[model samples]
Target: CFARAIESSRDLLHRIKDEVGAPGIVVGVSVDGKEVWSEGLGYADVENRVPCKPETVMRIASISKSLTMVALAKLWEAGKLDLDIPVQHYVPEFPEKEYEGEKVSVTTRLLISHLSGIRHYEKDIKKVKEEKADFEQGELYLREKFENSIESLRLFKNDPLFFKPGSQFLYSTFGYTLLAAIVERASGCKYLDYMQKIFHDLDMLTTVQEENEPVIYNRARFYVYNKKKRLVNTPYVDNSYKWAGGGFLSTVGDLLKFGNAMLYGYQVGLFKNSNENLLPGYLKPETMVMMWTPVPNTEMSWDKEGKYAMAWGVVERKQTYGSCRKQRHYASHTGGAVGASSVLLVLPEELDTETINNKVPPRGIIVSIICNMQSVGLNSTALKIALEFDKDRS
Candidate 1:
């Protein structure tokens, strides 16, 4: 029962961690909406001698963006939100900015698709002259605490746009901060509270916002590169500012639980386990199609096909990573954060365009991988492992 897939994937992941300097790695694989394998390698805490396990928690990173997209879809169904409407309707705090000479209005669709023309850290870091003291070491390691996403808005709300709105894709974590405030305004509740209820409803108990003050059990110590290019302890940073962008911690188990639920909900438009049929309907099937499908007439931040879609990513062509086999066209999201890299991928049973169209019920494999390292290119490796699982299904 997918044992061959499990065995090969374990071997593959072990070999992966063996070569990388990452402190630990955790992977969870689900087949047809069931967790079949969960294994880890290396240490969750190297100094404390805590070995990595499936339960070891690490940052889900920007995968939190996809979480926001799901919440938006749910809210849209309730008529609390609209993707194409000007974002100021929900969060008036985000002001309309002039791009070049013309006043450009931002929309929820622009923010979620990352075509809002908002400047990312890469572009705005040089403009941090007065703030360069604390940010000189790099903004990712900032220790300052933000009380709310609105407070986070002050970081970039007045900044100039990267381009005319929806002109192109530019990855903006701050754009998502604006999105979080909309969630707050639309739901008439705290952003974290709404997300927490959704997590509990889905039984993703271990998935929570990574706050600084509390002691979260089994949380993995972070790692980053030092000036000497050696793995070192990462500086402390508060993720409170961007809970809807890149500020959550979870285990591979929890991510796979959520990932498989996405697959389930996309298949039948209800957020229920196939066997139970009594579970609540969370996301609409059409909304799933909308989120997974690429946004039309937009290119990526770089020169690639228009793949990013509403915080989710789609790879429509095969890609090879090292000596591993080619990856299939699938729906997924990858996250890279201060001290973490992660990916949650869904490969439908029949890998075809129709799967993205929701024309077929999805019955397939979902894989989630996370590590205590930044920008490790986990997507290729995760895709390889998922394909490995797909390969030896017998």
Candidate 2:
């Protein structure tokens, strides 16, 4: 079944590459805990003509938020965190920002769901100075400040809330920064160190926070389309300022490993059905239920049944597998910025009891799509590739 899907997708994906003028893309599709099909398209380095490969690392932008949430999930499972507790409990330095004269209490849960009313991306003096700093020196400078999870809080710790916490939904990339700070306080490790340990445990060796110098071996050169619709180099933006929000560089293969482990029922690693290996399991099945549950429809643009869950966007879709079609639920996320775009989707069959049936055996599929160019239709193309794997095997 996997062979046929890859064989058929070759031409379709090539056409997509040409149509979108993507400098490069890496795609991986896995089913039932094994990599079935993987491929790379276009040049990783357009100037030198380095062809993109499955292992090519690109900045995953906000997808890093989902990864951060996983870090938090581990902490939660270990009794290091109480999601419902006030954020101030973990990071006491978190300021008392208000909305409409009311002191809105923020919690880790609220931050993950974007219900904390934390303002997103407020332009401040620090951001302006960092953006204008020399790329090499600037990145190093920002890293020094942000590498410490608590220091990262200075970015927006004093901003006013957009609405009362838990009363409304607003996407705040900075909100994840607070979660990163909490991770540090709760775990007694630097944020990057903690993430490194997590990735190391998962064998995701190539993923890392953006660094001052170009260190990743196969890291793709970043690109963007300018006002004239021609490819140009993306401006040098230091990601250190938002490491928790969107700062990690990773390969599609590494993401697939993470996704498949989530669906593996936690038999072998830190995460499993019994929660024995919370480190290997990463998240308990119950935690998965909590993170994937959608927010109230009133607070989001998605249908009442479809909304954000943790860092993921949740929705139910009717998917086809050969002649079989069923309603499958997905906890998915897309990330993009100046020079890169990425999409990660995990369709958990066993978890969707409402629409699942015996006709299709209980199994999960993970699709990872990554591209170096921040082109217009990247998500559309990546999603098309993901849906191609939505067939029933038995």
Candidate 3:
């Protein structure tokens, strides 16, 4: 069964590469905290005929939020920050904007769960186009114009929220920028520096926090299909303004490392070490549980089945094992930028103990897929591929 699943998964991924029209596609899958299969299809640089590798680095877009949440989780585990407290306690500059005639103070939990009411980008690019003026000026412009995550908050700091904090679930990349500011204020270190420490400790060598990364080996160039169906370089836009929200470069291997850490940190009793090495197990079991629990849809406007967790999306499925059937749960996060789409899907199933109880496999499964094209529906496509492996496991 396992062998068949592997072959089927490989075939499905190759078909996706052809159908999606992405220049490059890389996928990594792990079971029991070990990588079982990985594949790279197509070209990382179409112009140069460079093939994509499992280690090819690409912009991971909103998956950066999942990483940021881990940073915050580390702080929460160490007792340096409170997730439920008003965010203004850490970042005093977080503007108190009014919603529905009442001033709403955002909370750390709200921001992490996308319930903060902070605005996200519109489907249209009017606001994004206006912001790119600063990006056009180059690295110096990025440095001077947006010195830090706190300063970038000014872009939407004064704007009114869509609803009162915790009243609804509106995806907000801007909301995470506030969380980044809080990480800086609470940790007494730059946000990127703190993130780097986490990535380094995990041995994620290919991951980088800078959008202006001048020199990176095995970096995949982004491309998109134009109206004429020809692949071209994607539009230029510096993600520095929203680094915490959607500004990080990483490879499928690096993402798998991070995903495995999150998937098995509690089950295997492995802990993340702090930068100082003073604190081991950066995140506690309770914290991981909290991070995985879905936030209730308070407004009931959309998502009848509360899906958004703290940065992770909670999804449920059911499977049958011989004569028994069980409901399974998984956490996933997808990312997309100008020319990249990525996904990290984790299933934290209970470990099997060699008993006849038909327990799910230990360490669950982690799937990471990265493609250098902004196909909006690619997230679902990736999920479908991941589930193929998951179905076989069940």
Candidate 4:
């Protein structure tokens, strides 16, 4: 089974590389919490000819939110913070804003689920120049470094709420920027410090907050297409400001481990259940359920309501997963950072051996893929790769 998955996915990846002309792509898969296959194609550093490897670190973009969610969940599970409380409770620096003639409180719940009205980076370059003369849009390029999560909020903290909080789902990277500041305050540690501990706990050593100036080993060189649609070097940008949302570097291997924990580590046997705990590690099962379930009345701006749950998207529709002989549940996330596109898909439910042998291996299968090129529609590409190993027919 492992050998079949290895060959099948490898072939699919070769086709993907040919189809997309990505500078590099790394894919890793785990079954039942064990790594079944990992491979890399093309080059990490095309100039020097560094082959992309399963360990090659690249921008994880919004998938950073999922990782940040772990730290937030740990704080909540420890009674250090409450998710439903006002954001100002932890981040007092955040000024209260009036919405609909009344102040609607924003909380970690709103931020994680993207129900907060915080503005994400202005996609409209002209609008950015009009709204804030000096603040340049970083959609293409940015070199300025934000001092901290608190400092990053200067970009939009005073701005009016996009809508009354929780009335609609507007994707906000800045919302996560504030959430990280809350993480810093509630944990009594720097955001990065707390995140590192969580990464260590998950054994995701290859994951790190992206720092633009420093040379990270095995980090893939970013790429983009020129006007002619040919691959070219991507413009340099500093992602430090929004580490909690879209500013992290990671490997496919690391993402698989993170997904496994998000899916399976909710209930564990080991470790002291300190502070009146039931589940021993990662997050409480109830907390996991809450985070995994979509917030009510919150519809995604990009898609319909109930498609998103916290940072991860709940996958049950065949439209996303593609056709399979046996329907299965999946928890997944996609990241499209500057010069990067990636996806992490997990089928977390329990499985049977006959289904694993005869049909798609959805029981405990995980597929993680990342590319150095941005906006390549990798959501579908990753799904194709997952189906390659599905062992199911159309």
Please give each candidate's TM-score: 0.86, 0.82, 0.83, 0.84
Model 3 C-alpha lDDT per residue in residues 46-141, reported as the tens digit of each score: 888999888788888888998898898888778899877788788777667775577667788778777777666553335633643311223312
Q: Which residue pairs collide, candidate 1?
A: none
On residues 1-394, what C-alpha lDDT tens digit does candidate 4 reach at each position? 5676577667877887778788788888776667778888889988899998877888888788888888887788889998778988878888898876896888778788777777666645356336533124554366678878888878777777766677766667788888889989888889888888888888988888778567778877888788898878877677777788787888888888777776555433222232234344467668878777855655433224237887778755444344645544566777777678888877654444454344331245678888888676555556555666665322
At residue 238, give the lDDT of candidate 1.
Answer: 78
TM-score of structure candidate 1? 0.86
lDDT of each: 0.76, 0.71, 0.72, 0.73
Worst 10 residues of 3 by lDDT: 270-279
Model 3 stretches with alpha carbons more than 4 Å out? 123-145, 269-282, 298-306, 317-327, 350-362, 379-381, 390-394
Backbone clashes in each candidate structure, one number apiece?
0, 9, 0, 0
Sorted on lDDT, highest at the top, how do the candidates line up? 1, 4, 3, 2
For residues 201-247, write the lDDT of model 2, one tens digit per residue: 88898888788576568878988777798888876666777888888
Candidate 1, position 360, lDDT: 35
Model 2 global lDDT (CA atoms, 0 to 1): 0.71
Best by lDDT: 1
Q: Model 3 misses residue 306 by how many Å? A: 6.1
RMSD (Å) of each candidate, 1 decimal? 5.3, 6.4, 6.3, 5.7
